[PDB]
Design a protein around this nucleic acid. Structure first.
Ligand SMILES: [K+]
Ligand SMILES: [Mg+2]
Ligand SMILES: [Mg+2]
Ligand SMILES: [Mg+2]
Ligand SMILES: [Mg+2]
Ligand SMILES: [Mg+2]
Ligand SMILES: [Mg+2]
Ligand SMILES: [Mg+2]
Ligand SMILES: [Mg+2]
Ligand SMILES: [Mg+2]
Ligand SMILES: [Mg+2]
Ligand SMILES: [Mg+2]
Ligand SMILES: [Mg+2]
Ligand SMILES: [Mg+2]
Ligand SMILES: [Mg+2]
Ligand SMILES: [Mg+2]
Ligand SMILES: [Mg+2]
Ligand SMILES: [Mg+2]
Ligand SMILES: [Mg+2]
Ligand SMILES: [Mg+2]
Ligand SMILES: [Mg+2]
Ligand SMILES: [Mg+2]
Ligand SMILES: [Mg+2]
Ligand SMILES: [Mg+2]
Ligand SMILES: [Mg+2]
Ligand SMILES: [Mg+2]
Lengths: 23, 208, 53, 303
RNA sequence: CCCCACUAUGCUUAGCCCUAAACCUCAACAGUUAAUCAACAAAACUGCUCGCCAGAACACUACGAGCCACAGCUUAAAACUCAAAGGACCUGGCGGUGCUUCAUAUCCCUCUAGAGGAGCCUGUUCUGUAAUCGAUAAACCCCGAUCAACCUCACCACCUCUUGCUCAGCCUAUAUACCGCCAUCUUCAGCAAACCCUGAUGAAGGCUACAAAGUAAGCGCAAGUACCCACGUAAAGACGUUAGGUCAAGGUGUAGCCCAUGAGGUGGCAAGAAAUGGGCUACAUUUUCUACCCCAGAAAAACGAUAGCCCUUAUGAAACUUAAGGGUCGAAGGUGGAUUUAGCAGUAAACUGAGAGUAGAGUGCUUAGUUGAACAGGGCCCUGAAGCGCGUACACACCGCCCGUCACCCUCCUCAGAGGAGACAAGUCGUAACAUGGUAAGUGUACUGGAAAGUGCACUUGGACGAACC
């Protein structure tokens, strides 16, 4: 199987961690 | 090629055909009997059975030819041989009997030995290991060695450093220098050998 | 100083060894020519049957 | 079909009689060669392809061999190997195998017919590998000490596979000579070589050293005589037209060699042929082709 | 990413933390192998029990709650949005894709002659003008043109005619409607109707010669044919690819003008700031001039224009603007950088004719002939080919798809204004993911960085390692 769902989740998590760091 | 693959190059050699039948091994007799029923290419207009024929000089003339001027190339070759012979005769006459024994006057021998001296033993070839080509040293087969010697001779004679000096005299002088193991052609052979030695460390880059 | 006159022996050895190398290449090529092709023919004759019949 | 071919044969007989009447020849002794000549005269066609030209041949030669129906009214095929689809080929293979079994139990003149010939014999379409299999089997049969009983069969599949010395003529003064011709490029040379002479060679009425001031051409003239060790033994009168100096020299060389063949022994003639002194150089100028600089030179490519 | 140094950290003790692609992605227990089974994967099921699931995204998120956790973990929504998202396969394209064998003037080296440097001829782009059009990567660029002074001419300026040479006309748009004729792979050998079989009767696939499901008309190759052989060169070269070229050969569908986008007359541009493609001439001593067509004599700092200027002649009604000849001048240049073209033999190279077309006109094209070579042996980085495979998120098919930041607007949610999500929607910086995606990808966690993301530690294959010995 491809990892497109995992990639979507990875981007979500990365953006969330970045936002938490920012604020 | 207007000749079908069944055509074989002729063998122009009087001694080969005049060889006694009893002196022929079974394979040689088989070869002759087979050739008795094989198509043969017509003899090219360059080589004959003449006893004065010299394949090396013929090839040198061909290499010296420019634009199909066989007459002019042969003229230059014969003029060079005559000049070499005249210079050697002059040295022989002007030289004392002690060194007259060693002084050579055969232009054909002088030419053969000059080319042999010019022959390079090792050349530089691009060899590739991993995706990069390097000027790896490599032995040069006999054909390549002879060709390189002849081409170096011809190019050095053709250089523009010698002005108003006709090719006969230029080539005679260069051939004499090579015979005596000197001159720009031998210098070029030594430069090739020096570069090969300098890149000796890359020998393993060769795979064959 | 790259004067072959007094290096004649080593130069002749090098040339003979190069000629022997080419001869060895030729003999090795002809000798190489069980072969994978023949072995694949044999395996085709007796194929693996990972299914039923 | 068979009835169609029979009607065609009747038509051909009637038409052959009619054509014989037309040409005035005897209908009885009218042969296929006569029919072909008469048709070529009456229907002149310049079409290069001979097959495209008018033809009035026997229906047997015209129509292809049609395979007859392979079963009877009851539907049962005739040959027990019918269902193989290659009954004739496999019958031949079966017979060869039987002969090989019997042989095993008991104990430059021809070639093997081509696959097309075998197909024609078997009125069936074969394959390269089928042909190779059959040829291997036949070769095994040949090697297996095939006697007359087997050789009679084998030969059904076998297909059968030196300079022409000129006659020596005599001049008015009784001197013997030989005349020959040779062409090189555009040069054509006719050479007359006398049996006895002092080596003189007169080309176009001119001495050879004057006609061919080029050492290469003089060497080419020398090459045949020098090869057979007959320098100074023969006089030559040559006439060469067309081409340049080198083409003329080559043509004269070929003509002289061919003429001298009449005066050298057969072994010497064969040696000359092996040396290539009797082969007509087929190398001629290659025509220029449109859209390119020369015969092979192409116009400078512009990426 | 690669190299070096070094810290947290990996280690021990005592506590925390409580997360993994924590996956053998296959729950515990008992049983069966019988009548199989969407695909793939690790064969199909039966009974019983618990846990969990009910379109995607929002979302490993907000809020609430619990916790030694204070940028955390567990549980976990809704609103707005969409008609899809997804899983497994088949065919193709592609792979900075693997093994093997190769390219035969061919991909690299190797051989010869060139271009890339100079002048000139010519084409094109750009500029210029009132002053055509078309080709324009291989497959345009001495190309339509085997040819432009007027004509040709379709262009521009001005003038003139209107049932007009035509039972009108249009060189007006559309080659992305076409016929016609072709370029291209093709320096290929395959395209194949009609049947049969396999796959559970899915898209699809169809071979092993000691043969295992293919048979095949037809087209092509081949064969046959022209030239000088049976060799070679021509010719031929299918089905398809590039909506490749041509509406300007002509015809033609559609559309458009009809006192003009039609027709006729006079005159006129068709040049060079400059770049670039092809060719010719050269740079000379294997050369230059002469005689001859190859046994010579002079030249040699001169060699070198087919350009420039003047004159004459040829054609024409018209010549400074076309050609030839002569005179005059003696210019740049001194064998050319990376790069690049062609050639396997009567070839490359050099030289000499003839022809098509014109009244005349090319250094262009077609073609005949002469002299006439060198290398042809090694290999697979780049180009490519075939076979056998592998991967695939591409299918407009890698000139693809696609991720994130920054600013471009509308809806919803949380919120003291600001954030988050989604959509609309064109950009900027990268090229992170999909091929070994050019550093395999990803999970947990920590640090770091415009940004996709980099790295450390452990884990997963949802990668491969080419699957006898070498
Ligand atoms: K150049
Ligand atoms: Mg997201
Ligand atoms: Mg584990
Ligand atoms: Mg988590
Ligand atoms: Mg949370
Ligand atoms: Mg909370
Ligand atoms: Mg090439
Ligand atoms: Mg130039
Ligand atoms: Mg134009
Ligand atoms: Mg255009
Ligand atoms: Mg006009
Ligand atoms: Mg005009
Ligand atoms: Mg008009
Ligand atoms: Mg088109
Ligand atoms: Mg052709
Ligand atoms: Mg053909
Ligand atoms: Mg188009
Ligand atoms: Mg167009
Ligand atoms: Mg008009
Ligand atoms: Mg002039
Ligand atoms: Mg006049
Ligand atoms: Mg001068
Ligand atoms: Mg990337
Ligand atoms: Mg990567
Ligand atoms: Mg990682
Ligand atoms: Mg870092």
């Amino acid at each position: 199987k491809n990892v497109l769902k995992i990639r979507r989740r990875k981007m979500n998590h990365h953006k969330y961690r970045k936002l938490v760091k920012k604020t | 090629s207007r000749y079908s693959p069944e055509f074989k190059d002729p063998l122009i050699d009087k001694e080969y055909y005049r060889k006694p039948v009893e002196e022929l091994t079974e394979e040689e007799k088989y070869v002759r009997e087979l050739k008795k029923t094989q198509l043969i290419k017509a003899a090219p207009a360059g080589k004959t059975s003449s006893v004065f024929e010299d394949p090396v000089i013929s090839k040198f003339t061909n290499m010296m030819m420019i634009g199909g001027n066989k007459v002019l190339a042969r003229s230059l070759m014969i003029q060079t041989l005559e000049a070499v012979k005249r210079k050697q005769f002059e040295k022989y006459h002007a030289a004392s009997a002690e060194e007259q024994a060693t002084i050579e006057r055969n232009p054909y021998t002088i030419f053969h030995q000059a080319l042999k001296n010019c022959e390079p033993m090792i050349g530089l070839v691009p060899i590739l290991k991993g995706g990069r080509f390097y000027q790896v040293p490599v032995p040069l087969p006999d054909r390549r060695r002879r060709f390189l010697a002849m081409k170096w001779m011809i190019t050095e004679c053709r250089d523009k450093k010698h002005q108003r000096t006709l090719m006969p005299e230029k080539l005679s002088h260069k051939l004499l220098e090579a015979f005596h193991n000197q001159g720009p052609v031998i210098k070029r052979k030594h430069d090739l050998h020096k570069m090969a030695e300098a890149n000796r460390a890359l020998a393993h880059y060769r795979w064959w | 100083e790259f004067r072959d006159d007094a290096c004649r022996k080593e130069i002749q050895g090098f040339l003979d060894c190069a000629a022997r190398a080419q001869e060895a290449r030729k003999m090795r090529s002809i000798q190489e020519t069980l072969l994978p092709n023949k072995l694949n023919k044999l395996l085709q004759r007796f194929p693996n049957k990972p299914y039923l019949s | 079909t068979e009835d169609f071919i029979k009607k065609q044969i009747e038509e051909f007989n009637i038409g052959k009689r009619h054509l014989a009447n037309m040409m005035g020849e005897d209908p009885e002794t009218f042969t296929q060669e006569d029919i072909d000549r008469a048709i070529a005269y009456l229907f002149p066609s310049g079409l290069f392809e001979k097959r495209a030209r008018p033809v009035m041949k026997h229906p047997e030669q015209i129509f292809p061999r049609q395979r007859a129906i392979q079963w009877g009214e009851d539907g049962r095929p005739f040959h027990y190997l019918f269902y193989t689809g290659k009954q004739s080929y496999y019958s031949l293979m079966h017979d060869v195998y039987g002969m090989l079994l019997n042989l095993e139990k008991h104990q430059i003149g021809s070639r093997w017919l081509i696959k097309e010939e075998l197909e024609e014999m078997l009125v069936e379409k074969l394959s390269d590998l089928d042909y190779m299999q059959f040829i291997r089997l036949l070769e095994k049969l040949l090697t297996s000490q095939c006697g007359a009983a087997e050789e009679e069969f084998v030969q059904r599949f076998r297909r059968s596979v030196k300079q022409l010395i000129e006659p020596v003529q005599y001049d008015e003064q009784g001197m013997a000579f030989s005349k020959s011709e040779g062409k090189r490029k555009t040069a054509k040379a006719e050479a007359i070589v006398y049996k006895h002479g002092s080596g003189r060679i007169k080309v176009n009425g001119i001495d050879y050293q004057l006609y061919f001031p080029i050492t290469q051409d003089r060497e080419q003239l020398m090459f045949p005589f020098h090869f057979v060790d007959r320098l100074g033994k023969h006089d030559v009168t040559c006439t060469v037209s067309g081409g340049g100096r080198s083409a003329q020299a080559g043509a004269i060389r070929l003509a002289m060699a061919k003429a001298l063949c009449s005066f050298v022994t057969e072994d010497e003639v064969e040696w000359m042929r092996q040396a290539g002194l009797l082969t007509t150089d087929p190398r001629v100028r290659e025509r220029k082709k449109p859209g390119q600089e020369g015969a092979r030179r192409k116009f400078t490519w512009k990426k």
